[PDB]
RNA sequence: AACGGGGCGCCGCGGCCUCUAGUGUACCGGUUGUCCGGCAGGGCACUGCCGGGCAGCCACGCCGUGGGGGAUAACCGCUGAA
């Protein structure tokens, strides 16, 4: 379809300061300062016109096709996620599932390490990025907290994918005659806010 | 079974000659037949033949011969609207 003009509005919440700066012909840099910290995002080569209006961010498209009109909801969702990150934060939870070999997960510094995964002598080591806090709850839960939902979710995805094997090392998901197979690893169980 | 850790080959490539092996009509010795009168020394038998063998060359000998980064393929995921 074709759109002569479309507009969307994201209401800025209390205590959150938004700055929008034009760094190019169609580029934007957005800074969101909240109680929990600061978030910075870039929107490059975009048809969406972003502006500020008395506590709201206005997103506008003029003479847009479907591919340009779809960007309004995406930018709205990104801005809402940034606001919720600076206000309440983000906290992703992961579960540690083992069948015979317990997987010792530990956070030392900005390395997170998994030992004894399936009895492997090798140890999985992951570099925790800036602005992500990793905590190990008991022998079964992992918590990743931050103010960037994309960064926190990406790190949780990396943690889950570290325990998934590929190639010839991939074990059979199901057992003999249809039972459960060797399903061992760390599974992202969900998300919530810090506050 | 596997990841991970330790050890070593085979194939190829590039060098080297210390060792070992080959050659080595440089060199040294033994010996057959005949000629130089005999001994000695020697000619020829196309090194006469046999044994050893420096240097050099050489392999059948020795030495070196790697991890990493980037963008990616097949795809696997995060966020995410229409
Ligand atoms: Mg060679
Ligand atoms: Mg000889
Ligand atoms: Mg004589
Ligand atoms: Mg004569
Ligand atoms: Mg002769």
From TrEMBL:
Q: Matching InterPro entries, A to Z?
A: Ribosomal_uL6-like, Ribosomal_uL6-like_a/b-dom_sf, Ribosomal_uL6_a/b-dom, Ribosomal_uL6_arc
Q: Which residues form the signal peptide?
A: none
A family per Pfam: Ribosomal_L6
Any one GO CC term of this protein is: cytosolic large ribosomal subunit
- Residues forming the Large ribosomal subunit protein uL6 alpha-beta domain are 12-89, 101-165
User: What is the top-level taxon of the source organism?
Assistant: Archaea
One annotated GO molecular function is: structural constituent of ribosome
| Assembly, per entry | Part of the 50S ribosomal subunit.
Q: Which family does it belong to?
A: Belongs to the universal ribosomal protein uL6 family.
**HAMAP family linked:** Ribosomal_uL6_A
Q: What does this protein do?
A: This protein binds to the 23S rRNA, and is important in its secondary structure. It is located near the subunit interface in the base of the L7/L12 stalk, and near the tRNA binding site of the peptidyltransferase center.
Q: What protein name does the entry list?
A: Large ribosomal subunit protein uL6
Organism placement in taxonomy? Archaea, Thermoproteota, Thermoprotei, Thermoproteales, Thermoproteaceae
Q: Which gene encodes it?
A: rpl6
């Amino acid at each position: 379809m074709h759109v002569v003009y479309a507009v969307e509005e994201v209401p800025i919440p209390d205590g959150v300061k938004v700055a929008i700066e034009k760094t190019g012909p169609f580029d934007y840099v957005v800074k969101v300062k909240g109680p929990l910290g600061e978030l910075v995002k870039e929107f490059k080569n975009t048809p969406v016109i972003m502006s500020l209006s008395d506590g709201k961010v206005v997103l506008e498209v003029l003479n847009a096709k479907k591919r340009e009109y779809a960007l309004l909801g995406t930018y709205k969702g990104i801005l809402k996620n940034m606001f919720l990150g600076v206000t309440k934060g983000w906290r992703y939870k992961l579960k540690v599932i083992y069948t015979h070999f317990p997987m010792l997960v530990k956070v030392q510094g900005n390395q997170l390490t998994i030992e004894n995964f399936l009895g492997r002598k090798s140890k999985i080591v992951l570099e925790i990025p800036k602005g992500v806090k990793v905590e190990v709850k008991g022998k079964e839960d992992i918590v990743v907290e931050g103010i960037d939902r994309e960064l926190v979710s990406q790190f949780a995805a990396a943690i889950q994918a570290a325990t998934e094997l590929r190639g010839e090392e991939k074990p059979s998901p199901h057992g003999r005659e249809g039972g459960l197979g060797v399903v061992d690893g760390i599974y992202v169980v969900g998300y919530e806010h810090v506050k």
